[PDB]
PDB file of N, CA and C in Angstrom:
ATOM      1  N   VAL A   1     -55.395 129.631 113.109  1.00  0.00           N
ATOM      2  CA  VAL A   1     -55.285 128.167 113.181  1.00  0.00           C
ATOM      3  C   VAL A   1     -55.366 127.514 111.803  1.00  0.00           C
ATOM      4  N   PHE A   2     -56.402 127.827 111.029  1.00  0.00           N
ATOM      5  CA  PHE A   2     -56.669 127.213 109.728  1.00  0.00           C
ATOM      6  C   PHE A   2     -56.050 128.012 108.569  1.00  0.00           C
ATOM      7  N   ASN A   3     -55.770 129.313 108.738  1.00  0.00           N
ATOM      8  CA  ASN A   3     -55.225 130.203 107.698  1.00  0.00           C
ATOM      9  C   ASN A   3     -53.873 130.866 108.060  1.00  0.00           C
ATOM     10  N   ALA A   4     -53.020 130.158 108.796  1.00  0.00           N
ATOM     11  CA  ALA A   4     -51.594 130.497 108.943  1.00  0.00           C
ATOM     12  C   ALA A   4     -50.808 130.348 107.631  1.00  0.00           C
ATOM     13  N   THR A   5     -49.680 131.055 107.478  1.00  0.00           N
ATOM     14  CA  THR A   5     -48.843 130.911 106.274  1.00  0.00           C
ATOM     15  C   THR A   5     -48.158 129.542 106.202  1.00  0.00           C
ATOM     16  N   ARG A   6     -47.664 129.016 107.328  1.00  0.00           N
ATOM     17  CA  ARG A   6     -46.979 127.710 107.408  1.00  0.00           C
ATOM     18  C   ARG A   6     -47.425 126.886 108.613  1.00  0.00           C
ATOM     19  N   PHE A   7     -47.549 125.579 108.429  1.00  0.00           N
ATOM     20  CA  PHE A   7     -47.874 124.620 109.491  1.00  0.00           C
ATOM     21  C   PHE A   7     -46.603 123.937 110.015  1.00  0.00           C
ATOM     22  N   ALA A   8     -46.685 123.297 111.180  1.00  0.00           N
ATOM     23  CA  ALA A   8     -45.560 122.565 111.750  1.00  0.00           C
ATOM     24  C   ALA A   8     -45.285 121.242 111.006  1.00  0.00           C
ATOM     25  N   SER A   9     -44.028 120.812 110.995  1.00  0.00           N
ATOM     26  CA  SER A   9     -43.650 119.429 110.697  1.00  0.00           C
ATOM     27  C   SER A   9     -44.277 118.493 111.736  1.00  0.00           C
ATOM     28  N   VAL A  10     -44.793 117.325 111.347  1.00  0.00           N
ATOM     29  CA  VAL A  10     -45.530 116.458 112.288  1.00  0.00           C
ATOM     30  C   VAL A  10     -44.694 116.032 113.490  1.00  0.00           C
ATOM     31  N   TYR A  11     -43.386 115.790 113.353  1.00  0.00           N
ATOM     32  CA  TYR A  11     -42.557 115.409 114.509  1.00  0.00           C
ATOM     33  C   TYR A  11     -42.583 116.455 115.643  1.00  0.00           C
ATOM     34  N   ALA A  12     -42.801 117.730 115.318  1.00  0.00           N
ATOM     35  CA  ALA A  12     -42.823 118.852 116.246  1.00  0.00           C
ATOM     36  C   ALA A  12     -44.150 119.630 116.139  1.00  0.00           C
ATOM     37  N   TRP A  13     -45.248 118.885 115.998  1.00  0.00           N
ATOM     38  CA  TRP A  13     -46.598 119.393 115.797  1.00  0.00           C
ATOM     39  C   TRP A  13     -46.972 120.494 116.795  1.00  0.00           C
ATOM     40  N   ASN A  14     -47.541 121.596 116.310  1.00  0.00           N
ATOM     41  CA  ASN A  14     -47.840 122.755 117.150  1.00  0.00           C
ATOM     42  C   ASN A  14     -49.106 122.532 118.000  1.00  0.00           C
ATOM     43  N   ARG A  15     -49.218 123.156 119.191  1.00  0.00           N
ATOM     44  CA  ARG A  15     -50.449 123.141 120.008  1.00  0.00           C
ATOM     45  C   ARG A  15     -50.904 124.557 120.538  1.00  0.00           C
ATOM     46  N   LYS A  16     -51.922 125.178 119.915  1.00  0.00           N
ATOM     47  CA  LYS A  16     -52.470 126.486 120.325  1.00  0.00           C
ATOM     48  C   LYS A  16     -53.667 126.329 121.257  1.00  0.00           C
ATOM     49  N   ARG A  17     -53.689 127.084 122.352  1.00  0.00           N
ATOM     50  CA  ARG A  17     -54.813 127.048 123.283  1.00  0.00           C
ATOM     51  C   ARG A  17     -55.911 128.072 122.933  1.00  0.00           C
ATOM     52  N   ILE A  18     -57.085 127.568 122.547  1.00  0.00           N
ATOM     53  CA  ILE A  18     -58.252 128.375 122.189  1.00  0.00           C
ATOM     54  C   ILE A  18     -59.067 128.558 123.466  1.00  0.00           C
ATOM     55  N   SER A  19     -59.313 129.807 123.836  1.00  0.00           N
ATOM     56  CA  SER A  19     -59.851 130.170 125.148  1.00  0.00           C
ATOM     57  C   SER A  19     -60.420 131.588 125.126  1.00  0.00           C
ATOM     58  N   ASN A  20     -61.306 131.887 126.078  1.00  0.00           N
ATOM     59  CA  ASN A  20     -61.905 133.205 126.309  1.00  0.00           C
ATOM     60  C   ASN A  20     -62.443 133.834 125.002  1.00  0.00           C
ATOM     61  N   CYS A  21     -63.177 133.024 124.227  1.00  0.00           N
ATOM     62  CA  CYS A  21     -63.628 133.314 122.869  1.00  0.00           C
ATOM     63  C   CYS A  21     -64.913 132.532 122.514  1.00  0.00           C
ATOM     64  N   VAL A  22     -65.700 133.000 121.543  1.00  0.00           N
ATOM     65  CA  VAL A  22     -66.879 132.293 121.016  1.00  0.00           C
ATOM     66  C   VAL A  22     -66.535 131.586 119.715  1.00  0.00           C
ATOM     67  N   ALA A  23     -66.946 130.336 119.580  1.00  0.00           N
ATOM     68  CA  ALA A  23     -66.578 129.459 118.493  1.00  0.00           C
ATOM     69  C   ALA A  23     -67.771 129.217 117.578  1.00  0.00           C
ATOM     70  N   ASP A  24     -67.604 129.332 116.257  1.00  0.00           N
ATOM     71  CA  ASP A  24     -68.672 129.023 115.307  1.00  0.00           C
ATOM     72  C   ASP A  24     -68.243 127.950 114.311  1.00  0.00           C
ATOM     73  N   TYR A  25     -68.340 126.720 114.792  1.00  0.00           N
ATOM     74  CA  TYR A  25     -68.071 125.512 114.028  1.00  0.00           C
ATOM     75  C   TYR A  25     -68.990 125.316 112.811  1.00  0.00           C
ATOM     76  N   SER A  26     -70.059 126.098 112.634  1.00  0.00           N
ATOM     77  CA  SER A  26     -70.826 126.070 111.384  1.00  0.00           C
ATOM     78  C   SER A  26     -70.010 126.654 110.228  1.00  0.00           C
ATOM     79  N   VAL A  27     -69.180 127.668 110.493  1.00  0.00           N
ATOM     80  CA  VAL A  27     -68.261 128.261 109.502  1.00  0.00           C
ATOM     81  C   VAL A  27     -67.204 127.245 109.068  1.00  0.00           C
ATOM     82  N   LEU A  28     -66.753 126.382 109.984  1.00  0.00           N
ATOM     83  CA  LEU A  28     -65.874 125.270 109.633  1.00  0.00           C
ATOM     84  C   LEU A  28     -66.649 124.153 108.909  1.00  0.00           C
ATOM     85  N   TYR A  29     -67.727 123.625 109.477  1.00  0.00           N
ATOM     86  CA  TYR A  29     -68.392 122.423 108.962  1.00  0.00           C
ATOM     87  C   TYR A  29     -69.046 122.631 107.584  1.00  0.00           C
ATOM     88  N   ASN A  30     -69.610 123.808 107.322  1.00  0.00           N
ATOM     89  CA  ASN A  30     -70.162 124.158 106.007  1.00  0.00           C
ATOM     90  C   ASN A  30     -69.084 124.325 104.920  1.00  0.00           C
ATOM     91  N   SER A  31     -67.807 124.507 105.290  1.00  0.00           N
ATOM     92  CA  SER A  31     -66.712 124.768 104.354  1.00  0.00           C
ATOM     93  C   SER A  31     -66.259 123.503 103.630  1.00  0.00           C
ATOM     94  N   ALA A  32     -66.564 123.412 102.328  1.00  0.00           N
ATOM     95  CA  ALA A  32     -66.298 122.247 101.476  1.00  0.00           C
ATOM     96  C   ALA A  32     -64.799 121.927 101.248  1.00  0.00           C
ATOM     97  N   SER A  33     -63.895 122.810 101.684  1.00  0.00           N
ATOM     98  CA  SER A  33     -62.435 122.643 101.654  1.00  0.00           C
ATOM     99  C   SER A  33     -61.928 121.467 102.510  1.00  0.00           C
ATOM    100  N   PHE A  34     -62.643 121.106 103.578  1.00  0.00           N
ATOM    101  CA  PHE A  34     -62.250 120.039 104.499  1.00  0.00           C
ATOM    102  C   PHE A  34     -62.622 118.653 103.956  1.00  0.00           C
ATOM    103  N   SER A  35     -61.629 117.960 103.406  1.00  0.00           N
ATOM    104  CA  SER A  35     -61.746 116.586 102.882  1.00  0.00           C
ATOM    105  C   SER A  35     -62.019 115.522 103.953  1.00  0.00           C
ATOM    106  N   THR A  36     -61.644 115.811 105.206  1.00  0.00           N
ATOM    107  CA  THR A  36     -62.077 115.105 106.417  1.00  0.00           C
ATOM    108  C   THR A  36     -62.508 116.156 107.436  1.00  0.00           C
ATOM    109  N   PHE A  37     -63.652 115.932 108.086  1.00  0.00           N
ATOM    110  CA  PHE A  37     -64.111 116.652 109.276  1.00  0.00           C
ATOM    111  C   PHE A  37     -64.848 115.641 110.167  1.00  0.00           C
ATOM    112  N   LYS A  38     -64.092 114.810 110.894  1.00  0.00           N
ATOM    113  CA  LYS A  38     -64.634 113.679 111.660  1.00  0.00           C
ATOM    114  C   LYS A  38     -64.570 113.961 113.150  1.00  0.00           C
ATOM    115  N   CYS A  39     -65.690 113.837 113.857  1.00  0.00           N
ATOM    116  CA  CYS A  39     -65.793 114.085 115.299  1.00  0.00           C
ATOM    117  C   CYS A  39     -66.031 112.802 116.109  1.00  0.00           C
ATOM    118  N   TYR A  40     -65.445 112.731 117.304  1.00  0.00           N
ATOM    119  CA  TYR A  40     -65.230 111.463 118.017  1.00  0.00           C
ATOM    120  C   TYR A  40     -65.898 111.350 119.394  1.00  0.00           C
ATOM    121  N   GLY A  41     -66.509 112.419 119.902  1.00  0.00           N
ATOM    122  CA  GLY A  41     -67.266 112.422 121.164  1.00  0.00           C
ATOM    123  C   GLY A  41     -68.441 113.404 121.172  1.00  0.00           C
ATOM    124  N   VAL A  42     -68.719 114.011 120.024  1.00  0.00           N
ATOM    125  CA  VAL A  42     -69.815 114.935 119.721  1.00  0.00           C
ATOM    126  C   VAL A  42     -70.167 114.767 118.243  1.00  0.00           C
ATOM    127  N   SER A  43     -71.393 115.086 117.857  1.00  0.00           N
ATOM    128  CA  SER A  43     -71.791 115.229 116.455  1.00  0.00           C
ATOM    129  C   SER A  43     -71.476 116.642 115.971  1.00  0.00           C
ATOM    130  N   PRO A  44     -71.069 116.841 114.696  1.00  0.00           N
ATOM    131  CA  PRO A  44     -70.665 118.155 114.199  1.00  0.00           C
ATOM    132  C   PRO A  44     -71.809 119.180 114.255  1.00  0.00           C
ATOM    133  N   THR A  45     -73.053 118.751 114.041  1.00  0.00           N
ATOM    134  CA  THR A  45     -74.247 119.598 114.192  1.00  0.00           C
ATOM    135  C   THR A  45     -74.486 120.081 115.621  1.00  0.00           C
ATOM    136  N   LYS A  46     -73.967 119.384 116.642  1.00  0.00           N
ATOM    137  CA  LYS A  46     -74.108 119.746 118.060  1.00  0.00           C
ATOM    138  C   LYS A  46     -73.014 120.691 118.564  1.00  0.00           C
ATOM    139  N   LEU A  47     -71.914 120.876 117.831  1.00  0.00           N
ATOM    140  CA  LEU A  47     -70.811 121.759 118.226  1.00  0.00           C
ATOM    141  C   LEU A  47     -71.260 123.216 118.480  1.00  0.00           C
ATOM    142  N   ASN A  48     -72.314 123.685 117.804  1.00  0.00           N
ATOM    143  CA  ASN A  48     -72.895 125.014 118.006  1.00  0.00           C
ATOM    144  C   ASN A  48     -73.794 125.161 119.258  1.00  0.00           C
ATOM    145  N   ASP A  49     -74.274 124.061 119.847  1.00  0.00           N
ATOM    146  CA  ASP A  49     -75.207 124.056 120.991  1.00  0.00           C
ATOM    147  C   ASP A  49     -74.494 124.002 122.356  1.00  0.00           C
TER     148      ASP A  49
ATOM    149  N   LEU B   1     -87.667  88.626  96.606  1.00  0.00           N
ATOM    150  CA  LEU B   1     -88.440  89.615  97.361  1.00  0.00           C
ATOM    151  C   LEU B   1     -89.422  90.418  96.485  1.00  0.00           C
ATOM    152  N   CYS B   2     -90.464  90.984  97.094  1.00  0.00           N
ATOM    153  CA  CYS B   2     -91.471  91.823  96.431  1.00  0.00           C
ATOM    154  C   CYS B   2     -91.708  93.132  97.180  1.00  0.00           C
ATOM    155  N   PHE B   3     -92.283  94.103  96.474  1.00  0.00           N
ATOM    156  CA  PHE B   3     -92.314  95.505  96.852  1.00  0.00           C
ATOM    157  C   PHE B   3     -93.734  96.056  96.645  1.00  0.00           C
ATOM    158  N   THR B   4     -94.218  96.810  97.621  1.00  0.00           N
ATOM    159  CA  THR B   4     -95.637  97.213  97.752  1.00  0.00           C
ATOM    160  C   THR B   4     -95.943  98.493  96.971  1.00  0.00           C
ATOM    161  N   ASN B   5     -95.032  99.449  97.045  1.00  0.00           N
ATOM    162  CA  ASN B   5     -94.878 100.575  96.133  1.00  0.00           C
ATOM    163  C   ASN B   5     -93.379 100.767  95.896  1.00  0.00           C
ATOM    164  N   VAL B   6     -93.004 101.269  94.728  1.00  0.00           N
ATOM    165  CA  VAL B   6     -91.610 101.550  94.387  1.00  0.00           C
ATOM    166  C   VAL B   6     -91.517 102.886  93.669  1.00  0.00           C
ATOM    167  N   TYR B   7     -90.605 103.740  94.116  1.00  0.00           N
ATOM    168  CA  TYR B   7     -90.326 105.030  93.495  1.00  0.00           C
ATOM    169  C   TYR B   7     -88.832 105.231  93.324  1.00  0.00           C
ATOM    170  N   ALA B   8     -88.423 105.487  92.082  1.00  0.00           N
ATOM    171  CA  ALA B   8     -87.077 105.878  91.722  1.00  0.00           C
ATOM    172  C   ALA B   8     -86.971 107.400  91.610  1.00  0.00           C
ATOM    173  N   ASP B   9     -86.093 107.989  92.411  1.00  0.00           N
ATOM    174  CA  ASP B   9     -85.794 109.418  92.418  1.00  0.00           C
ATOM    175  C   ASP B   9     -84.471 109.666  91.681  1.00  0.00           C
ATOM    176  N   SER B  10     -84.495 110.451  90.600  1.00  0.00           N
ATOM    177  CA  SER B  10     -83.348 110.717  89.713  1.00  0.00           C
ATOM    178  C   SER B  10     -82.864 112.163  89.806  1.00  0.00           C
ATOM    179  N   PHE B  11     -81.547 112.363  89.952  1.00  0.00           N
ATOM    180  CA  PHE B  11     -80.903 113.681  89.960  1.00  0.00           C
ATOM    181  C   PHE B  11     -79.377 113.614  89.734  1.00  0.00           C
ATOM    182  N   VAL B  12     -78.737 114.751  89.457  1.00  0.00           N
ATOM    183  CA  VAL B  12     -77.268 114.876  89.283  1.00  0.00           C
ATOM    184  C   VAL B  12     -76.635 115.795  90.328  1.00  0.00           C
ATOM    185  N   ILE B  13     -75.493 115.385  90.883  1.00  0.00           N
ATOM    186  CA  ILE B  13     -74.767 116.118  91.933  1.00  0.00           C
ATOM    187  C   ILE B  13     -73.245 116.041  91.747  1.00  0.00           C
ATOM    188  N   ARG B  14     -72.513 116.899  92.458  1.00  0.00           N
ATOM    189  CA  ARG B  14     -71.078 116.742  92.694  1.00  0.00           C
ATOM    190  C   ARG B  14     -70.779 115.382  93.340  1.00  0.00           C
ATOM    191  N   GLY B  15     -69.716 114.710  92.914  1.00  0.00           N
ATOM    192  CA  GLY B  15     -69.309 113.396  93.433  1.00  0.00           C
ATOM    193  C   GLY B  15     -68.921 113.353  94.925  1.00  0.00           C
ATOM    194  N   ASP B  16     -68.481 114.473  95.496  1.00  0.00           N
ATOM    195  CA  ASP B  16     -68.222 114.607  96.944  1.00  0.00           C
ATOM    196  C   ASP B  16     -69.512 114.504  97.778  1.00  0.00           C
ATOM    197  N   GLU B  17     -70.636 114.962  97.218  1.00  0.00           N
ATOM    198  CA  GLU B  17     -71.927 115.085  97.903  1.00  0.00           C
ATOM    199  C   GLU B  17     -72.740 113.777  97.886  1.00  0.00           C
ATOM    200  N   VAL B  18     -72.249 112.741  97.202  1.00  0.00           N
ATOM    201  CA  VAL B  18     -72.822 111.378  97.217  1.00  0.00           C
ATOM    202  C   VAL B  18     -73.014 110.867  98.642  1.00  0.00           C
ATOM    203  N   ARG B  19     -72.095 111.210  99.538  1.00  0.00           N
ATOM    204  CA  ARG B  19     -72.229 110.820 100.938  1.00  0.00           C
ATOM    205  C   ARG B  19     -73.491 111.447 101.570  1.00  0.00           C
ATOM    206  N   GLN B  20     -73.739 112.722 101.281  1.00  0.00           N
ATOM    207  CA  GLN B  20     -74.910 113.440 101.808  1.00  0.00           C
ATOM    208  C   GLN B  20     -76.229 112.740 101.434  1.00  0.00           C
ATOM    209  N   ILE B  21     -76.253 111.864 100.425  1.00  0.00           N
ATOM    210  CA  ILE B  21     -77.482 111.166 100.026  1.00  0.00           C
ATOM    211  C   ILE B  21     -77.859 110.027 101.015  1.00  0.00           C
ATOM    212  N   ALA B  22     -76.944 109.568 101.879  1.00  0.00           N
ATOM    213  CA  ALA B  22     -77.282 108.551 102.886  1.00  0.00           C
ATOM    214  C   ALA B  22     -78.249 109.088 103.977  1.00  0.00           C
ATOM    215  N   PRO B  23     -79.059 108.236 104.627  1.00  0.00           N
ATOM    216  CA  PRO B  23     -80.081 108.677 105.569  1.00  0.00           C
ATOM    217  C   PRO B  23     -79.491 109.252 106.863  1.00  0.00           C
ATOM    218  N   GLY B  24     -80.084 110.337 107.356  1.00  0.00           N
ATOM    219  CA  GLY B  24     -79.629 111.044 108.557  1.00  0.00           C
ATOM    220  C   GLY B  24     -78.416 111.963 108.377  1.00  0.00           C
ATOM    221  N   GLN B  25     -77.824 112.029 107.179  1.00  0.00           N
ATOM    222  CA  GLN B  25     -76.733 112.954 106.836  1.00  0.00           C
ATOM    223  C   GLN B  25     -77.208 114.411 106.709  1.00  0.00           C
ATOM    224  N   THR B  26     -76.270 115.334 106.498  1.00  0.00           N
ATOM    225  CA  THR B  26     -76.492 116.783 106.576  1.00  0.00           C
ATOM    226  C   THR B  26     -75.474 117.564 105.735  1.00  0.00           C
ATOM    227  N   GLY B  27     -75.778 118.807 105.370  1.00  0.00           N
ATOM    228  CA  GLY B  27     -75.110 119.571 104.312  1.00  0.00           C
ATOM    229  C   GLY B  27     -76.065 119.928 103.164  1.00  0.00           C
ATOM    230  N   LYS B  28     -75.682 120.858 102.275  1.00  0.00           N
ATOM    231  CA  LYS B  28     -76.615 121.564 101.358  1.00  0.00           C
ATOM    232  C   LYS B  28     -77.575 120.668 100.571  1.00  0.00           C
ATOM    233  N   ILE B  29     -77.167 119.475 100.122  1.00  0.00           N
ATOM    234  CA  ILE B  29     -78.088 118.579  99.419  1.00  0.00           C
ATOM    235  C   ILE B  29     -79.076 117.941 100.402  1.00  0.00           C
ATOM    236  N   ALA B  30     -78.573 117.351 101.490  1.00  0.00           N
ATOM    237  CA  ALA B  30     -79.368 116.709 102.533  1.00  0.00           C
ATOM    238  C   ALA B  30     -80.264 117.678 103.333  1.00  0.00           C
ATOM    239  N   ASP B  31     -79.934 118.969 103.344  1.00  0.00           N
ATOM    240  CA  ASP B  31     -80.654 120.026 104.059  1.00  0.00           C
ATOM    241  C   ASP B  31     -81.672 120.769 103.192  1.00  0.00           C
ATOM    242  N   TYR B  32     -81.309 121.171 101.973  1.00  0.00           N
ATOM    243  CA  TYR B  32     -82.258 121.968 101.172  1.00  0.00           C
ATOM    244  C   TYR B  32     -82.700 121.452  99.807  1.00  0.00           C
ATOM    245  N   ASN B  33     -82.189 120.306  99.388  1.00  0.00           N
ATOM    246  CA  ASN B  33     -82.553 119.750  98.077  1.00  0.00           C
ATOM    247  C   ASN B  33     -83.264 118.395  98.157  1.00  0.00           C
ATOM    248  N   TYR B  34     -82.652 117.410  98.815  1.00  0.00           N
ATOM    249  CA  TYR B  34     -83.124 116.034  98.834  1.00  0.00           C
ATOM    250  C   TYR B  34     -82.732 115.315 100.133  1.00  0.00           C
ATOM    251  N   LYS B  35     -83.704 115.119 101.031  1.00  0.00           N
ATOM    252  CA  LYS B  35     -83.506 114.440 102.317  1.00  0.00           C
ATOM    253  C   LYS B  35     -84.162 113.066 102.313  1.00  0.00           C
ATOM    254  N   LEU B  36     -83.423 112.028 102.694  1.00  0.00           N
ATOM    255  CA  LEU B  36     -83.987 110.706 102.981  1.00  0.00           C
ATOM    256  C   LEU B  36     -84.510 110.625 104.420  1.00  0.00           C
ATOM    257  N   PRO B  37     -85.547 109.827 104.711  1.00  0.00           N
ATOM    258  CA  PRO B  37     -85.954 109.548 106.087  1.00  0.00           C
ATOM    259  C   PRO B  37     -84.893 108.723 106.825  1.00  0.00           C
ATOM    260  N   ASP B  38     -84.868 108.809 108.153  1.00  0.00           N
ATOM    261  CA  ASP B  38     -83.858 108.122 108.977  1.00  0.00           C
ATOM    262  C   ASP B  38     -83.975 106.588 108.898  1.00  0.00           C
ATOM    263  N   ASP B  39     -85.215 106.109 108.827  1.00  0.00           N
ATOM    264  CA  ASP B  39     -85.604 104.709 108.648  1.00  0.00           C
ATOM    265  C   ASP B  39     -85.871 104.368 107.166  1.00  0.00           C
ATOM    266  N   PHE B  40     -85.152 105.000 106.234  1.00  0.00           N
ATOM    267  CA  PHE B  40     -85.188 104.701 104.797  1.00  0.00           C
ATOM    268  C   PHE B  40     -85.038 103.203 104.515  1.00  0.00           C
ATOM    269  N   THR B  41     -86.044 102.635 103.845  1.00  0.00           N
ATOM    270  CA  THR B  41     -86.024 101.276 103.285  1.00  0.00           C
ATOM    271  C   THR B  41     -85.930 101.448 101.768  1.00  0.00           C
ATOM    272  N   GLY B  42     -84.860 100.946 101.153  1.00  0.00           N
ATOM    273  CA  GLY B  42     -84.458 101.324  99.795  1.00  0.00           C
ATOM    274  C   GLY B  42     -82.948 101.298  99.557  1.00  0.00           C
ATOM    275  N   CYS B  43     -82.499 101.714  98.373  1.00  0.00           N
ATOM    276  CA  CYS B  43     -81.086 101.745  97.961  1.00  0.00           C
ATOM    277  C   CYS B  43     -80.715 103.082  97.296  1.00  0.00           C
ATOM    278  N   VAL B  44     -79.462 103.513  97.450  1.00  0.00           N
ATOM    279  CA  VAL B  44     -78.866 104.688  96.790  1.00  0.00           C
ATOM    280  C   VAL B  44     -77.783 104.227  95.821  1.00  0.00           C
ATOM    281  N   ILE B  45     -77.866 104.682  94.579  1.00  0.00           N
ATOM    282  CA  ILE B  45     -77.036 104.231  93.465  1.00  0.00           C
ATOM    283  C   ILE B  45     -76.460 105.443  92.759  1.00  0.00           C
ATOM    284  N   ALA B  46     -75.144 105.450  92.521  1.00  0.00           N
ATOM    285  CA  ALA B  46     -74.485 106.581  91.874  1.00  0.00           C
ATOM    286  C   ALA B  46     -73.325 106.175  90.957  1.00  0.00           C
ATOM    287  N   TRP B  47     -73.190 106.873  89.833  1.00  0.00           N
ATOM    288  CA  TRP B  47     -72.122 106.639  88.870  1.00  0.00           C
ATOM    289  C   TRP B  47     -71.564 107.941  88.314  1.00  0.00           C
ATOM    290  N   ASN B  48     -70.250 107.973  88.094  1.00  0.00           N
ATOM    291  CA  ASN B  48     -69.576 109.111  87.488  1.00  0.00           C
ATOM    292  C   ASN B  48     -70.113 109.295  86.059  1.00  0.00           C
TER     293      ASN B  48
END
């Protein structure tokens, strides 16, 4: 998702279904590469709980 | 206005991490170096 070689053009934006897997949003949120990481119905610290 | 006690805390950081200095924020400065209380009465000042 985050380390693909190429992303979609916005007019034809891609949609991947993440499922049957464990997610560690601390690996995302601690990563200083993200110039925006804004959450809209949860706090980023709660994504792990 | 008047002030009952006053303390100025001085330090240097990356300019991206200036946000982490606000109260209730989180990340390496706000977590392991310098945390403000949630009900912080005071001001945060920063310059390049």
